Design a protein around this nucleic acid. Structure first.
Ligand SMILES: Nc1ncnc2c1ncn2[C@@H]1O[C@H](CSCC[C@H](N)C(=O)O)[C@@H](O)[C@H]1O
Length: 327
DNA sequence: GTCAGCGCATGG
DNA sequence: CCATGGCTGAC
């Protein structure tokens, strides 16, 4: 993560829905806001959260009466993406994992917060011939909010990962906010090779396979794109090998392949997958964040999360717009 | 609960 | 043509 000296959000409160690791929390707290409620039902997510923040998130959102919730100013929520991802069955709202959005709607109507800030995958904006996005747009307008959405590739903001996501911000109609804007991009100056650990700590992650085919030569100069050097088996998800001089591919939570959830990389002549910590780093997490003791669960948790750095820049821009109230 | 081989939509 | 991003069955 980046460091914010001008704390544009001091004195405001928010809630953490579908918390996971608490990615939304680090982002907002670094700016000066305060967390007053949280909610996440996965047994293990509940453990890491407690370990790093010191409180236990409430359970199942579908059975929590909306009137218990504390008063707040910003509702943070990165709802489930398996029903909308380009790697799935694309069942949208017909999937019981796809109807969460409406519980958000339910909560919003009662507490009328100043800002709603959500996140989801690139394909959300194109699913069902574009109908799905309209539905979120119209429901938000009807509840008296404005709607702002855009797709941002992580490599345009300092993190070497090809992760494209749609971000959605909604201000309450009576505040009259007319100058919010999405941060401007910049040149990358960090690559996969600048975050790896020493060879003595990753020795157990190596893999020697004899169905290894080489389709390209290792490059000699840095670039901001994924460079495939080889393949194993048939070359499907988790069977592709890239270079440490380019950038990482999207980390996932239920992935397959011999190089599951992270991908394979050629390091100093040997091929291997990434360490939980090297995963924490390509997601922009700080070396002080204690990860879960069970390696397996740790991989899944990272593949489900958000990048910290992008959430930060957008967070700042939000506060700036709320703070401009001239005579 | 963990592992690994898959199979096809979408965007050039 | 060419490359990327969860589901399902096995123990
Ligand atoms: N019905 C429900 N009630 C509560 N939490 C739920 C839920 N359905 C799914 N979840 C949890 O929703 C999360 C969505 S992914 C979000 C990750 C989070 N943004 C990050 O910063 O790490 C998963 O952890 C899932 O276990």
């Amino acid at each position: 993560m980046i460091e914010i000296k001008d704390k544009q959000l001091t004195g405001l409160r928010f809630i953490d829905l579908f918390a996971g690791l608490g990615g939304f929390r680090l982002a907002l707290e670094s700016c000066g806001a305060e967390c007053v409620y949280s909610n996440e039902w996965d047994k293990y997510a509940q453990e890491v959260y407690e370990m790093n923040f010191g409180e236990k998130p409430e359970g199942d959102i579908t059975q929590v009466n909306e009137k218990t919730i504390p008063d707040h100013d910003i509702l943070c929520a990165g709802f489930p993406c398996q029903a909308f991802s380009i790697s799935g069955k694309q069942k949208g709202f017909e999937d019981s994992r796809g109807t969460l959005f409406f519980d958000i709607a339910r909560i919003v109507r009662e507490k009328k917060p100043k800002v709603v800030f959500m996140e989801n995958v690139k394909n959300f904006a194109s699913h069902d011939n574009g109908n799905t996005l309209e539905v979120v747009k119209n429901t938000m307008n009807e509840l008296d909010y404005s709607f702002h959405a855009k797709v941002l590739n992580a490599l345009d903001y300092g993190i070497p990962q090809k992760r494209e996501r749609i971000y959605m911000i909604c201000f309450r109609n009576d505040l009259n906010i007319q100058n919010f804007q999405f941060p401007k991009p910049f040149e990358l100056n960090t690559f996969v090779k600048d975050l790896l650990l020493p060879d003595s700590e990753v020795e157990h992650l190596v893999i020697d396979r004899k169905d290894l085919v080489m389709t390209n030569q290792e490059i000699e100069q840095t670039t901001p794109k994924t460079v495939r050097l080889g393949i194993v088996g048939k070359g499907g998800q988790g069977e592709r090998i890239y270079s440490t001089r380019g950038i990482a591919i999207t980390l996932s939570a239920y992935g397959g392949g011999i190089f599951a959830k992270t991908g394979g990389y050629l390091v100093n002549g040997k091929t291997r997958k990434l360490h939980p910590r090297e995963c924490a780093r390509v997601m922009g997490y700080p070396d002080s964040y204690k990860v879960h003791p069970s390696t397996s669960q740790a991989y899944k948790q990272f593949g489900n999360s958000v990048v910290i750095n992008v959430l930060q820049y957008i967070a700042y821009n939000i506060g700036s717009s709320l703070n401009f109230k001239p005579y």
